[PDB]
Design a protein around this ligand. Structure first.
Ligand SMILES: [Mg+2]
Lengths: 367, 165, 378, 251
RNA sequence: GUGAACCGGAUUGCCGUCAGGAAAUUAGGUGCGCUUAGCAGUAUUCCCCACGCUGUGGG
């Protein structure tokens, strides 16, 4: 089955994701300009959050020699590490993503041994290839490509491909984009002749209401982590909690946009469906209602249209709608689109775990 | 187009008290205050009766408030992208020109209900440079159909043509 | 009886391959080829590849051919990949012990396991013409022309534009057959069609024709070219050369221009009904008659009319989208819709869900309206 | 007879098909540049899919190595001007700015099926052909190319389908010669469907068809016109109506 | 059934860490909205029906 998460979140004036020129990212949707938050930024923010540290068992880095050196008290294991990695094929250095305990222990024991360089490189390559046991690796996948131009011809590589179990789309605004520019002037503590007219700076910021979409495949997540099952449930719960209560760390020391989502919808399906087309027409604010209410109403209308459209009696779908203390209902007028409207995040996590299987959150917090 | 010319003529016929009434209503909607609603209805409703292509209520209200605040003299051929663009040739290219250009260009991402303050700052920039004439009818015609791409293209092209001289 | 038949070839994309395509680089010709047109006719009539070579291709080879380039397309290239994630077939086979048997004798012993495959990805680049239109005139016997037109009216098989991913944008049998003496007159008879009111239009239309031998002998001129597009077979393909000349026709004197005859931009419907149209006054008077000149809220004498919905404006107005109201209630309703974006459906005074609001607004008027301001109209 | 299917589908910002340089595929039409999705992507997207796996079928519809396939898929084209965009990304180290291309567009898709070829390829069977047509309709309605989907989860569904039974093949690309310009009182999909409606409002003036929109969200014809023989708000009901017209089979 | 048919450019990635537009300004000087009128001592009170050569009853 497939777990589908949809979120509506309004943010204060801030700059979370910025381009090379230092401006908030934008895109074109429905023929109009919308604000954009990239998918990799969200994935990185969720990965390095406090609600996911119990499952952060992977490292993506190019400085593997330093990590191997740190697994030694006084032995000199730096130049030999670089030579072994160079014969491996990592000759700019290639980024390597794999588990921490495996690389530390196995690289320390193999590298410090008195063996041939080719054999040590082959064993290191095998260890790197077989180190794919971590929730983040299973969620985000992996693609390692050794450089055949400057690698030892004697060594041979094995399969190093991990198919991802998570799909994240770029966050887009439900309305038109309104970029803004703030002008700043730095002051001097000690008086004196001072500068001329002053060096006026420029900082670009914007505020928008974003729609977020996440998709998780349970079968692929289980297959990635081998026959283990409780770990998958723990990963799903921790991912839901982290996505609920984590924001990117952009200019947060000057733009403390720590806002929380106002509406979440979790559905259990067999095929992926995206509700982005609910915002092809931009949302316009009138004297009544606010941005979030209109966005949720449009989302509910599109969900009702989709449910009353592509519908098969042989595979009905169900989901839960969560709003803080039931403040933003989905079916504002009459429709009961959701089945088990929940007013607490922990209750929603418990319901999701219960539907996935006979899982209690307390029990699964041990793997 | 007939309907806007008579509207601007009626606006130009107002006296100090009505101008002050409209001035004190800046930043407000048409419904909350009754004297402004009555004055706008008296000025506008017969025109809508006689002419079907009369300007909509929102655009007329915005133009009335702007005219009450600034009180420019009507003259054909003195549109905003020409005076702004002839002014922009006297600023420092490195610093001041981008700052003015961004404020002039921000108008393309706002609807008719959010085009009061940017137009206010643009007209203040105009007033700072001793400008006494403006084309109100043309501005109203542009604002009526602001949701069409050729209108914005012509606006920007006129700005560039005035600036490159 | 007509002696020539016309074909229109138009679409978003089309391709007519040339002789310079023997590898993964497939290029296209500037004009539709004779072989492609004959194959299209054969597909329309319903003859297979092995049957066309027998007394169906020689008959169509005798027809004279001419193409008029109405508008030429832009050359575009597409990057094509084959067999990614699968295995491609190879042609390698084990050599026989003796040269006595080969071909059909060895083909009878072929087994599914004897074939060999390899995991790879084939790369290619293919050429197309974008936004191009062509007119083809085929001249010959009248019975054959009638048969071809009848077959083209209803095709047996699907017909495309050189490649199966190129469906036509206009009917192929748009122009009925006629009688003409030369190819030039036939090509000048059909007019030239525009697509919208303001678009560039070619001043001169090129044309590519077959070269008539004239009298016996008459060696080909110095501007004649050789095109390898005379079909002899389709399985395996076999083509023969032919002589081709090029001419031109200047529009406005021999080729006419047709009108738009259509609407391009859709645009929404019409709001903004007129308050001076006689029909509006008639329906307003009728509605006031139906309501007994009584307001629908306070039951006071009624003087104005409120539009519940704006489905129709001006031309048509049923007396069912209108309600009778007095001055105060109409003003309250007007001030209750200033910035709500109701568009089509407006306030219905009969709905109780509005009542508590409307009266409230009325109170404000009775507290603040000045009769000396409505009088002395400014 | 020939069954023609026209689809209008809007996609979120994504990259479903790119060339050797990594940019989305494009084409030229109406004097402008338009986004393009290749035919051999939609095919092999509908094919080899798990949903479509529902006298060997899947070869009669789409042949392999003189099979004479009965399915024709055209190139997906955009109804407006192409708007490519560049995303700037960097890679962290937790212990060099790159650029990628992406775009968003609304696509018009055209499919054709030859009923007689399908029947002949199945060796006279007529119920199996109808089942194959229904399965193909369901698969095409609910399948998208598997491009950069892990980074661009673009799983949108079509907003309008039209099924026609014309005597000769013809595509309605000429309804999009003028690129669609978005106005405040409408949206892109509505304007595209209106442009399509004002191409069958003509032609007939100067056959039958079935129109499908999700829960009658977008009705064909911006009036009370009879340009569509039947308007259906459910995909299964559309399949049933087509099945009935094919000669009266039950889905 | 067309240099045609069978035909995916695919897999991996935070732009994060830095900033007072600030110092000084009266919008002042002059002006009648004025000349006019019973809600009442009548000579047809806008329409309809019935009884008489004005009296009842309905709008
Ligand atoms: Mg009333």
């Amino acid at each position: 089955m497939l777990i589908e998460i949809h979120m509506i979140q309004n943010h204060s004036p801030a700059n979370l994701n910025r381009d090379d020129l230092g401006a908030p990212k934008t895109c074109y949707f429905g023929g109009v300009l919308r604000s954009r938050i990239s998918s990799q930024c969200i994935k990185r923010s969720i990965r390095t959050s406090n609600d996911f540290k119990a499952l952060l068992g992977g490292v993506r880095t190019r400085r593997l020699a330093d990590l191997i050196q740190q697994e030694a008290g006084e032995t000199e294991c730096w130049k030999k590490a670089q030579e072994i990695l160079n014969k491996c094929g990592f000759k700019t250095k290639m980024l390597v993503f794999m588990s921490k305990d495996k690389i530390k222990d196995l690289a320390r024991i193999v590298l410090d041994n008195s063996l041939g360089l080719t054999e040590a490189a082959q064993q290191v390559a095998n260890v790197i290839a077989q180190a794919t046991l971590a929730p983040d690796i299973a969620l985000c996948g992996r693609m390692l490509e050794p450089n055949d131009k400057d690698k030892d011809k004697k060594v041979k590589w094995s399969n190093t491909t991990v198919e991802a179990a998570l799909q994240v789309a770029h966050a887009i605004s439900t309305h038109i984009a309104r970029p803004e520019i703030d002008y700043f002037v730095a002051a001097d503590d000690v008086p004196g002749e001072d500068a001329g007219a002053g060096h006026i700076g420029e900082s670009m910021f914007a505020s928008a209401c974003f729609y977020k979409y996440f998709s998780i495949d349970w079968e692929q997540l289980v297959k990635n982590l081998k026959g283990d099952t409780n770990l998958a449930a723990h990963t799903v719960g921790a991912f839901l909690l982290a996505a609920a209560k984590t924001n990117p760390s952009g200019k947060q020391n000057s733009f403390a946009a720590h806002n929380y989502p106002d509406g979440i919808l979790v559905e259990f399906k067999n095929s992926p469906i995206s509700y982005a087309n609910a915002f092809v027409r931009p949302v316009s604010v009138v004297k009544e209602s606010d941005l979030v209410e209109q966005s949720i109403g449009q989302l509910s209308n599109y969900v009702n249209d989709i449910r009353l459209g592509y519908y098969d009696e042989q595979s009905p779908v169900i989901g839960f709608w969560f709003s803080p203390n039931n403040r933003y209902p989905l079916g504002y007028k009459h429709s009961k689109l959701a089945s088990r409207n929940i007013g607490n995040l922990n209750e929603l996590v418990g319901a999701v775990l219960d539907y996935i299987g006979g899982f209690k959150w307390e029990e699964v917090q041990k793997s | 187009n007939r309907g806007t010319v008579d509207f601007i003529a009626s606006l130009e016929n107002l006296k100090e008290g009505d101008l002050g009434i409209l001035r004190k209503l800046r930043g407000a909607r048409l419904d909350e205050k009754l004297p402004g609603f009555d004055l706008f209805s008296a000025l506008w409703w017969p025109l809508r009766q006689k002419n079907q292509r009369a300007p909509k209520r929102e655009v007329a209200w915005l133009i009335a408030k702007l005219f009450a605040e600034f009180r420019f003299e009507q003259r054909e051929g003195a549109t905003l992208p020409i005076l702004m663009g002839g002014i922009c040739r006297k600023l420092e290219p490195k610093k001041e020109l981008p700052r003015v250009l961004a404020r002039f260009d921000q108008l393309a991402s706002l609807d008719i209900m959010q085009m009061e303050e940017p137009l206010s700052v643009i007209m203040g920039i105009l007033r700072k440079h001793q400008q006494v004439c403006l084309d109100w009818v043309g501005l109203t015609d542009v604002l009526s159909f602001w949701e069409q791409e050729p209108v914005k293209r012509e606006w920007s092209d006129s700005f560039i043509k005035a600036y490159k001289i | 009886p007509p002696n020539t038949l016309f074909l229109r070839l138009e679409g978003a994309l089309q391709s007519w391959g040339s002789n310079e395509a023997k590898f993964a680089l497939r290029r296209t010709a500037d004009a539709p080829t004779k072989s492609g047109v004959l194959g299209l006719l054969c597909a329309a009539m319903g003859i297979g590849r092995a049957e066309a070579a027998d007394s169906w291709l020689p008959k169509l080879a005798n027809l004279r051919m001419g193409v008029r380039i109405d508008r030429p397309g832009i050359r575009w290239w597409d990057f094509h990949t084959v067999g990614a994630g699968q295995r491609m077939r190879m042609a390698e086979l084990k050599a026989p012990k003796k040269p006595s048997m080969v071909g059909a004798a060895l083909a009878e012993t072929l087994t599914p396991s004897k074939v060999k495959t390899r995991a790879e990805t084939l790369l290619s680049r293919r050429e197309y013409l974008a936004d191009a239109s062509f007119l083809v005139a085929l001249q010959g016997e009248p019975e054959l022309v009638a048969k071809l037109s009848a077959a083209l009216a209803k095709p047996v098989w699907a017909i495309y534009l050189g490649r199966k991913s190129c469906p036509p944008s206009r009917p192929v049998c748009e122009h009925p057959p006629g009688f003409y003496n030369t190819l030039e007159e036939a090509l000048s008879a059909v007019p030239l069609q525009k697509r919208w009111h303001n678009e560039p239009l070619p001043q001169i239309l090129p044309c590519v024709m077959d070269w008539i031998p004239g009298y016996d002998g008459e060696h080909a001129p110095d501007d004649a070219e050789i095109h390898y597009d005379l079909p002899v077979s389709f399985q395996p393909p076999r083509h023969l050369p032919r002589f081709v000349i090029r001419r031109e026709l200047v529009v406005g004197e021999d080729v006419q221009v047709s009108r738009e005859t259509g609407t391009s931009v859709w645009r929404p419907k019409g709001t903004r009904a007129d308050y001076n149209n006689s029909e509006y006054k008639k329906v307003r008077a009728e509605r006031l008659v139906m309501d007994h000149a009584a307001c629908m809220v306070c039951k006071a004498p009624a003087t104005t009319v409120q539009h519940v919905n704006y489905r129709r404006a001006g031309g048509k107005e049923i007396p069912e989208d209108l309600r009778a109201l007095c001055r105060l209630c109409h003003d309250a309703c007007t001030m209750l819709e200033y910035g709500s974006g109701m568009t089509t459906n407006r306030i219905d005074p009969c709905d109780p869900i509005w009542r508590e609001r409307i009266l409230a607004k009325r109170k404000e008027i009775v507290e603040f309206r000045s009769r000396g301001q409505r009088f002395r109209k400014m």
